[PDB]
Amino acid sequence: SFSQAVSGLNAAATNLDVIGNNIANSATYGFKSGTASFADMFAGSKVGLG
Amino acid sequence: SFSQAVSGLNAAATNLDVIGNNIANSATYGFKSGTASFADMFAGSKVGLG
Amino acid sequence: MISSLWIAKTGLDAQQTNMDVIANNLANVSTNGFKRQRAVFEDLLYQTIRQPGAQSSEQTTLPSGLQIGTGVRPVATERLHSQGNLSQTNNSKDVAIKGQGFFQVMLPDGTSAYTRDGSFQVDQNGQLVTAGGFQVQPAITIPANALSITIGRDGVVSVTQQGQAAPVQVGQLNLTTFMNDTGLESIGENLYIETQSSGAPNESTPGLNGAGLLYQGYVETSNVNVAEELVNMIQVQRAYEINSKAVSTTDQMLQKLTQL
Amino acid sequence: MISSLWIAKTGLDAQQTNMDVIANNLANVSTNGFKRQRAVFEDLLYQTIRQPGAQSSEQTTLPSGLQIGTGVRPVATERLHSQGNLSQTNNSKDVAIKGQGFFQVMLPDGTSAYTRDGSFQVDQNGQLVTAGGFQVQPAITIPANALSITIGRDGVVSVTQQGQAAPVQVGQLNLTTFMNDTGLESIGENLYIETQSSGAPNESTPGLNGAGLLYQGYVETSNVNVAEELVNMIQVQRAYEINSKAVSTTDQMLQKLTQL
Amino acid sequence: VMLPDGTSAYTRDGSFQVDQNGQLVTAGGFQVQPAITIPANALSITIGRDGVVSVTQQGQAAPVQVGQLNLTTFMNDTGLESIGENLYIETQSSGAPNESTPGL
Amino acid sequence: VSVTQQGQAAPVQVGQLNLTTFMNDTGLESIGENLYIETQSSGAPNESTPGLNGAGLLYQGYVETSNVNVAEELVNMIQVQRAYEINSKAVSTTDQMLQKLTQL
Amino acid sequence: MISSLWIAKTGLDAQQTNMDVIANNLANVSTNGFKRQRAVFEDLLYQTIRQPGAQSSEQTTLPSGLQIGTGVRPVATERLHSQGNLSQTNNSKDVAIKGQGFFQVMLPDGTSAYTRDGSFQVDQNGQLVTAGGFQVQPAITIPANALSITIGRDGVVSVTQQGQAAPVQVGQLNLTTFMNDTGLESIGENLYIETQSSGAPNESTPGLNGAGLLYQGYVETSNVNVAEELVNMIQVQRAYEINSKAVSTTDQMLQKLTQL
Amino acid sequence: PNTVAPVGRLKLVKAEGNEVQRSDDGLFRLTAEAQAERGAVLAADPSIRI
Amino acid sequence: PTGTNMQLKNVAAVMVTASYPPFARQGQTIDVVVSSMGNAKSLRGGTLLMTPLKGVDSQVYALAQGNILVGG
Amino acid sequence: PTGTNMQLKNVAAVMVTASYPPFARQGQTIDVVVSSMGNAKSLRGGTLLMTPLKGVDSQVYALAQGNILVGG
Structure with a gap:
């Protein structure tokens, strides 16, 4: 149950990376913001992988 | 005391969600505000359930 | 090697499963179209050392005999199918469902x-x-x-298209609904496949006999509630620690049984 | 081969049974609709030797003569059928009981x-x-x-259903009540069956002559009180210590007789 | 036996x-x-x-009565003849084997 | 069972686990590697479906462990050891009595 | 020397084997794509003495006669070939399997x-x-x-490649599946060789015939669950201690025989 | 082990000391007076237990 | 009662065989042979209860009842 | 009842063989040989129950029943 939480921590870090990159480019001509999409990694149901 | 307190926590969360919904619809024509009603869940009369 | 050790070795595993479910739910707090899980548990064997209701005398029955039980087992983790809050991404390519239907892929x-x-x-x-x-x-x-x-x-x-005042229809999006949504088998990547406990895939149009409605520019977020998961982590941690204490007490009993 | 050793062995077995019951109770903390179990012990027989109340002398009798007791043995494990604290899972299919009834499957x-x-x-x-x-x-x-x-x-x-302002009734959930609720035989899987010590199943409506009220979106958690279990674990460990010490003392005495 | x-x-x-x-x-x-x-x-x-x-028996909320394990009481139990294979036989000084329902 | 298989939304039945029920379980002969063979004291092996005719249920993912109670065995070792030490002393006493007798 | 000594020696050896398996599982927590091991034990020979089922009388049978058993021996070591949790290493050269396939080298x-x-x-x-x-x-x-x-x-x-808008194909990573994955012979270096009990090597692409899917940038961690290993260490230690006590009891018995 | 079947029954007889005489090869045989009353061959006693 | 345990020791289930003689007339008597059918030790002094002797056509041609004579 | 345990000791399953004589007429009698078929210890004083003796064409040509004579 450690890898499952580590994966969520990594996903939150990626989200915050995207948010910081968007903020840093607040005034940058021709910049289009980014958005991170997440999907679960269920193996065979009844158990999660992160 | 970890099931009687959880109930109060959830009730307060519901009340706060209702308040936030009222605030968010400050400018919404035809909107009616909402309020939450709570009632105790006593059993025997010496054992409270939240 | 002793009964209480096996029982507390099942308690540990059940609480570890509960922690796994909680951690998986918290890790996917941001994935769109997510349904959170709930683990259910049930009692294991019950050794009928004294069958309840046995006829001791010819007229007196024995009430509630010596029914020493075994530990716990989890039946399954069921998906709590509820409507997640919709958000406004404003991307003509994001669509959100309002009812209880599914997209087919x-x-x-x-x-x-x-x-x-x-x-x-x-x-x-x-x-x-x-x-x-x-x-x-x-x-x-x-x-x-x-x-x-x-x-x-x-x-x-x-x-x-360009310079044309009338839109061109390029298809029709349909929603699939099931008798039991919980029984679907999750294969990852936000995908579920049909299982015999989920009945059969009933295709329907969005607004008729029970498919949901589609809103453009909206994304369906997860239904995971962070505060409840925090409280559940606290209770699961305490339960796991107490079952480990039971393991330790059994260990001490066996040790000072052997040492005589 | 020596009486005190059999008595202390019976004491050790009883304490192990108590620890097994405690571990089973602690392993089912997260189980919904679980009732904690408590074991009750009795002493075993009593060697007669000198019948008390016999004539000690022509005009006098023996007050409380010489009775030598054997060990201990568990009578039965009784459940505590009390309303486990409720929990809101916000699910349209989860049902909890407020009173004293059971679902039939x-x-x-x-x-x-x-x-x-x-x-x-x-x-x-x-x-x-x-x-x-x-x-x-x-x-x-x-x-x-x-x-x-x-x-x-x-x-x-x-x-x-869709487009109908009136709801369609599709069943009626009844509750079964027993004269002796603790006499049911638990088969595991959160299931109890009727025995001859549990009377007969009386079907009743949930709200009538003593069946409980059904709450939707609520689940009845277990009634296990964990601090009591920790204190009882301490008690059981100390009792097992003392019984093992009695066994060791008897072992030391027989050694001197062997040496004789 | x-x-x-x-x-x-x-x-x-x-x-x-x-x-x-x-x-x-x-x-x-x-x-x-x-x-x-x-x-x-x-x-x-x-x-x-x-x-x-x-x-x-499965499905039968009631138990099926099979038999009564009545015992045998003698008057002078010390007079019994121990024949070996954990068995006592009645002797002249331990006669009158009285069958009884245990507890009676 | x-x-x-991939693609199929409906599982395919493969086989049936039949439980063999004996009427006298303890009369079986333990042939070694976790196997019992029927004897004249445990005749008529009855094939049955699990859950019917008194047969047991099947739980998948769990294995039945040994039912050996540990404290009972330790107390029994204590009893056995001291008993073997009291019988050895009886042997020694008989030996000394014989030595004294045959010495004269 | 004495039967009980050999039996307890076999018990000690079996518990040492269990501890060896436990230590091997624990030492490989950080190994990628490692499968935990489990030992299976069986009863040794059974001295027959009295034949169970023999004719004691003309109309009675001998129920469950005198069978004296020998010690214990491990049957075999079985792996748990299940999907381990994935870890993101953010490397283009690391591939993880989502199903039940193997890489062939x-x-x-x-x-x-x-x-x-x-x-x-x-x-x-x-x-x-x-x-x-x-x-x-x-x-x-x-x-x-x-x-x-x-x-x-x-x-x-x-x-x-640079200056080319279309990617070029330089290979096709395939997966090999076996009828029996537990029958593969481990040789170390995270390598398994074919045996006659592991069926035949079925070569297939990822997605068809059951073979798993490949994820780039992820690695498959070991499936070793620590809490089970800790409880099993407690079990192994206490069982070893009991068997050593039995050996000591046999030693004291033999010594008392020697003194006379 | 299901094959176990009876084959034959050992002949067990009952004789006191006053009836038997040790022959020259160590095997006891019925004395003359005892043989004349009990017959030539001793019938097996069903009460004997081995 | 249907649910009960009867453990008898003086009763044996037997098969009775006889010969239907030529020109047999009703009221005449014939000899029968009585053979035990399951795990019975002996039929020393038993009495055969009313037994209908069927033919090949499964019709009753004789009624059997008497005292068995076993050699001894 | 179909589900029950019968453990017999006085019954043996046997095969009966005979010769159909030339110009045999119905009502005449012939000798038969009775041979045990499975794990039976002896047929000392048994009685053969009604047995139809088939031919090669699987038609009944004789009916067998009597007392077996075993040498001893």
């Missing part, structure tokens, strides 16, 4: 999976696909010379 | 079992079943295009 | 086993008198305080 |  | 081994090798100045 191997994630993209050939590159049914194609994509509340996908 | 064998756990699902055919797939009496059939399932305080299950 | 020759012995060793044809017998196989026959479909076997042997 |  | 002797570890490197020649330098049959050679390597869900390996 064709897997590369020829079979069909079902997803509630509405973040759709367009491939190089112009077909609507899931963000994982899986082509969504019914294969709605989008021309190269497209100016705006309009997906209505009934699932009709329309494309307005 | 049918085993595959055709017999009827009784369960208090209310975590219900729907199968592929639309009938309300438990987590183990057992069909809950009285067999409420949920139709294909249901929008919301409402279970009231008195056990009526209603389904609201 | 019924000896192979046809006469009855008496034992206090209560460790019994069910033989192929049901029937409760001692550790040596001698049938324990008078017989208690346990069926095959039994889920639990209970010998009560009074000696009523009831079994649980 | 059902097996799920 | 070539040993320097020319024979083929099978590994589930996905930590791959590129040698000076550009061939995709494992961490130990074995060439992962087949080929996947890599061009000189690659900018990025893309391995799809179905094993297609592509390289993006």
